Each structure stands twice: as C-alpha cells, then as structure tokens.
C-alpha cells in the first residue's frame, strides 16, 4: 500500500516536472532553467491539503495527483513516506527536506489541518506577527530556510513578498550534497569551448574522465543519455545530450518538443541503457534562480487558488484566504568532487 503511494507521488512529480519545464520553456527558450519539482510539489501539496472544491481540483490536476473534490489520501501518504526516505539518518552524504507552517498569531487554523500537516508533511505551525511585524516575520522565515539549506538559499523572501496582509506562509526546503561515486580529477580539468549554438560558443572549465557509466544511445531520436551516480548509487545525475547541434538554436528543439515523463521514465530505466566505457567531458557549472510561480501555475490551470473565489476551508472556517505568491529559489553547483543542490518554495497566503 505504502509502496504504491510512493510510486504514485514520484510519478506525479515526474509528470509535473515536464509540464512545469514546458511552461517555463515557452517564454524563456534561451535561458538556464533549474528548479526542484520535489520542493514545489511538496509546498503546494501541503497547500492542497487545505483546499476545497475547484480550488483543490485544479491543484490536483496541475500537480498530477488526479487526472483532468475528494482529497487524494494516497498522495499525502506517498509524500509522507518519501519524506521519511529522504531524511534517513546518514553520514556518507547530505540529503534532507523539511516543511513548516508560518501563520499570523491572531489567525486560528483548524486542529485537523495541523495534525494532518504534521503527520503527512512533518510541518509544525509557528505563530508569527505578520500584521504589525512583517519584517521580523520575514527574517525569521528566511533564517529557517538558511538553516535547512546550509545557507545556500539565503534571503528567500523579500519585503515585497511579506506584508501586513500576509496570513500564512507554507514553506518547503530541500538540501542535497554528495560526492560522485567516481570523482573527476582536477588535473584533467581545462578551459574548453561550450557551444551555445552552431554559430556561438563560450569558454568553460571542462572536467574530463574515462570511465564506465550506464549509457542509452537513441540514434533515431538524435540523443544519448548517461547516468552519473553519487556515492552508493542512491542518487544519480542523469544528463540528456542531443547527438550534436542539429537545429537553429540550442540543439534541444527536438528533445524539448518530444519531452514526456512517460518517455523519460522509459529511458531512465531502459534495458538498452547498459554500462559503457566513455570519454566523459562535463562542464564545471553552477546555477542560481528565483521566480514567483503565480503566473506560471495560472497558465498551467491552477487559477482559482489565486483569486477572491479561492476556498481553503480545509484549514479554516472562513473563506477569506487566497494564494498571493509562490516563491521558488534554487541552487546547484557541479564540480570534480560531486554536486551541491538546494531549493525552497514559499506559498504565501493572504
């Protein structure tokens, strides 16, 4: 039962990842994109727990909890067990995720919502003074996020995000740091050209090694995929690389046009993806980003939650709450030793 629940949530997150990427890609075809769909889905799932009617239904459909309202209890259960799996005690690498509910001290929440939030998301409520101390409250939340992220997600919320009208902020944080199973040797790293397009390139620190990794060759679809395991292969970085640059922009036009999670799932655990000796060249790179996902989520079909018709009576008896912002901030650094990655998502309700 619990195993199936975990598979359903993992599948929902995978579907959401592709949909989210596709929506982000529509407006920004030529920019770096990086996010944690785990963090975004976790924070919005904790929000969905409180949703009712069309507010809930739309969120469930966008997040792939349901197909396009009865609460998806299987999903909340799946998130619980996944969170437990990610937070397993260990000292061979770093993986942790946490959720928290920040609420206006004067605003009463339903006890049933708090016990369910604690059960399924390990989210405890912290009363804060939004009404007459929004800056105090903001810094308090940002400090917690810093602690959960080893200070890699620093000032999550700005003064434009937390105001006197703010009533709840539901936050997820995730932190990951691990060595590669097989680390690159720094002496083999050198300055090499990274080709942005057919007619453009820029210099980057290119890491190099010759070793054996699982590789899927898809000649017909013009791409290859490789898995780069972290220690004990408990997590991996997968890289999808087009065979060359075979279009007028980034080389990813075919891949991005044909991207589905069904395809991505089939590739990622394919029998054709066998252990292959490879001359691996990988850039040393780091990405940071920040976005308010309101507009994006609205364009994906999550509309009612951001309106004066929003219904969050799962957490309150009054229909006086709506989502104002969904702040997502991310960070990743890839180097010879491994990868450090981090993110936070803050659902701001007023």
């Amino acid at each position: 039962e619990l195993e199936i629940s975990m598979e359903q949530v993992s599948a929902s997150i995978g579907n959401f990842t592709v949909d989210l990427f596709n929506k982000l890609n529509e407006t920004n075809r030529d920019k770096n994109i990086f996010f944690s769909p785990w963090s975004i889905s976790s924070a919005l799932a904790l929000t969905y727990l409180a949703a009712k009617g069309s507010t809930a239904r739309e969120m469930a459909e966008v997040l792939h909890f349901t197909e396009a309202h009865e609460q998806a209890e299987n999903i909340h259960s799946g998130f619980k067990e996944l969170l437990t799996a990610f937070n397993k005690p260990r000292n061979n690498y770093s993986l942790r995720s946490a959720n928290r509910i920040y609420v206006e001290k004067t605003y009463a929440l339903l006890p049933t919502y708090l016990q369910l939030s604690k059960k399924y998301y390990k989210a405890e409520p912290q009363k804060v003074n939004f009404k007459t101390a929004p800056e105090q409250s903001r810094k308090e939340i940002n400090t917690w996020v810093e602690k959960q992220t080893e200070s890699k997600i620093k000032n999550l919320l700005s003064s434009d995000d937390v105001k006197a009208t703010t009533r709840l902020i539901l936050v997820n944080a995730i932190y990951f740091k691990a060595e590669w199973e097989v680390k690159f040797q720094a002496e083999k790293t050198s300055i090499q050209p990274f080709r942005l397009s057919k007619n453009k390139s820029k210099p980057v620190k290119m890491m190099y090694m010759r070793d054996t990794f699982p590789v899927l060759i898809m000649e017909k679809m013009n791409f290859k995929m490789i898995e780069l395991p972290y220690v004990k292969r408990e997590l991996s970085m997968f890289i999808l690389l087009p065979d060359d640059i075979k279009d007028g922009t980034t080389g990813l036009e075919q891949l991005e046009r044909e991207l589905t999670y069904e395809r991505l799932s089939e590739w990622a655990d394919s029998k054709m993806m066998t252990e292959t000796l490879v001359d691996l060249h990988l850039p040393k790179f780091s990405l940071e980003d920040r976005i308010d996902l309101r507009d994006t989520l609205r364009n994906m079909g999550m509309t009612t939650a951001f309106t004066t018709n929003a219904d969050f009576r799962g957490m309150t008896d009054k229909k006086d709450l709506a989502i104002s912002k969904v702040i997502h901030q991310s960070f990743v650094a890839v180097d010879e030793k491994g990868t450090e990655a981090a993110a936070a998502t803050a659902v701001i309700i007023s």
């Binding site: 598979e7 993992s10 770096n32 944690s36 769909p37 799996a85 990610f86 970085m237 990813l252």
Partner: protein, 33 residues
C-alpha cells in the same frame, strides 16, 4: 572502443533518488556564466 560523451553543447539534467525514482532537481544548461 570508447564512446565519446562530450557535454559541450546545451543539455537537460536532473538529480534522481534512484530507489523511489523521484526527480528532486531538474534543469537545462544552455548558457555559461
């Protein structure tokens, strides 16, 4: 032979928890710096 896997042009990448097959981070790198 040795297969050339040279990541010197735009690519998608993601970090996965393998046992659960959960994508934790997803991205596209197409623009250095």
């Amino acid at each position: 032979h040795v297969l050339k896997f040279k990541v010197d042009h735009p690519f998608h990448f993601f970090i996965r928890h393998n046992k659960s097959k959960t994508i934790l981070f997803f991205g596209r790198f197409c623009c250095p710096v």
